[PDB]
Design a protein around this ligand. Structure first.
Ligand SMILES: CCCCCCCCOCCOCCOCCOCCO
Ligand SMILES: CCCCCCCCOCCOCCOCCOCCO
Ligand SMILES: CCCCCCCCOCCOCCOCCOCCO
Ligand SMILES: CCCCCCCCOCCOCCOCCOCCO
Ligand SMILES: CCCCCCCCOCCOCCOCCOCCO
Ligand SMILES: CCCCCCCCOCCOCCOCCOCCO
Length: 305
């Protein structure tokens, strides 16, 4: 009984964890979503972004995702402050697998942001969104077969940082970010070998913290600019209030959520071409976590006018 129970627990936990990755895939930061929003003349904007990535964890879990996003905003000009207020829509296709399961998630989201760029070098970014997830996963363990189900998520994220110019052309930028969410629970009930089995998890609420530093060196001409940049951060769960319940003939079993944390590493660039066009690009990975991003690439483009 004990061996059987460990296996089921490991398998259930692996499967249900895709809901955790789903959520984490939609967490980003200002520079990754918007590019560099400093010293922009135009009073309106339209932008787009693509991210592609792969990650992994024990049990042979691997995943990779494609995240597409577009938004539009107005920039209000204030005393030493530009405040961008706008809307955004996102699409994510992700695929995932491990020793005992396989499948795909499809996500559509919408939201609202405000980004506040201060002349002093300070910034605040606030974002609220809703994401709807269609999921299809196939396991072989337990006789669970194929399962389709929906989930949804709410996101409320706040980021602050400060760009200190060490030289006319070199800079350092400490940053802090806090992202609060929700994730809908689901239940499977099925039969295997004449026996009623069951698997259910409650709604839960991620809180994800990040602290880090970016550093940058810029180069310019009259009608162009390029900044090379790099950065080191620490990303960490502050809660793990999820719980899965396994239930069979013999009895119940509760598996509680565990916190994960990882070190974030990245390198890239933001370009300015003439008056309306900006482009940003980063390569990223993480180290030291149960789940790490093994590599990912983010591109964004903004047209300001
Ligand atoms: C932590 C929650 C933060 C929620 C952000 C609120 C920011 C307000 O966004 C307003 C959207 O503005 C639309 C303006 O119209 C542009 C087209
Ligand atoms: C503004 C940057 C501050 C980042 C501090 C990093 C703290 C690292 O925590 C390590 C503890 O990990 C548990 C072992
Ligand atoms: C700039 C600070 C970077 C330090 C981050 C360390 C991450 C610690 O990882 C522990 C995760 O697994 C436990
Ligand atoms: C103990 C391991 C901690 C160090 C991790 C390895 C660092 C070597 O790679 C340099 C990464 O530079 C930062 C930018 O990362 C770009 C991601 O793309 C490369 C993925 O391999
Ligand atoms: C992740 C890609 C990193 C891209 C590096 C930045 C390249 C842009 O630099 C433009 C330099 O303009 C000419 C001045 O020369 C500076 C010497 O350093 C150039 C190193 O490539
Ligand atoms: C290293 C910069 C890459 C940016 C690619 C997009 C540039 C398109 O700008 C064209 C402007 O046309 C006028």
């Amino acid at each position: 009984h004990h061996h059987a129970n460990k296996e089921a627990t490991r398998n259930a936990a692996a499967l249900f964890s895709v809901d955790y990755k789903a959520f984490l895939n939609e967490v980003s930061n200002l520079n990754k979503r918007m590019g560099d929003l400093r010293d922009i003349n135009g009073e309106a904007g339209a932008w787009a972004r693509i991210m592609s990535g792969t990650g992994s964890a024990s049990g042979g879990f691997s995943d990779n995702y494609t995240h597409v996003q577009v938004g539009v905003d107005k920039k209000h000009e204030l005393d030493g402050l530009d405040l961008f207020t706008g809307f955004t829509v996102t699409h994510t296709d992700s695929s995932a697998s491990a020793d005992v399961f396989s499948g795909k998630t499809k996500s559509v989201g919408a939201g609202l942001y405000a980004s506040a760029m201060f002349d002093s070098g300070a910034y605040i970014d606030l974002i609220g969104k809703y994401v709807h997830h269609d999921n299809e996963y196939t396991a072989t363990f337990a006789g669970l077969g194929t399962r389709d189900y929906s989930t949804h998520s709410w996101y409320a994220g706040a980021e602050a940082g400060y760009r200190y110019h060490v030289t006319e052309d070199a800079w350092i930028e400490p940053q802090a970010e806090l992202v609060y969410g929700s994730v809908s629970g689901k239940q499977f009930a099925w039969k295997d070998q004449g026996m009623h089995l069951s698997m259910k998890d409650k709604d839960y609420n991620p809180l994800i913290g990040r602290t880090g530093v970016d550093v940058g060196k810029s180069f310019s001409g009259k009608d162009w600019k390029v900044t090379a940049r790099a950065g080191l951060g620490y990303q960490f769960d502050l809660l793990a209030n999820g719980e899965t319940v396994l239930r069979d003939a013999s009895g119940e079993k509760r598996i509680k959520g565990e916190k994960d944390s990882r070190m974030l590493m990245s390198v890239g660039l933001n370009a300015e071409i003439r008056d309306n066009v900006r482009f940003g690009l980063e390569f990223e990975k993480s180290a030291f976590g149960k789940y790490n991003v093994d590599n990912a690439v983010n591109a964004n483009f903004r047209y300001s006018f």
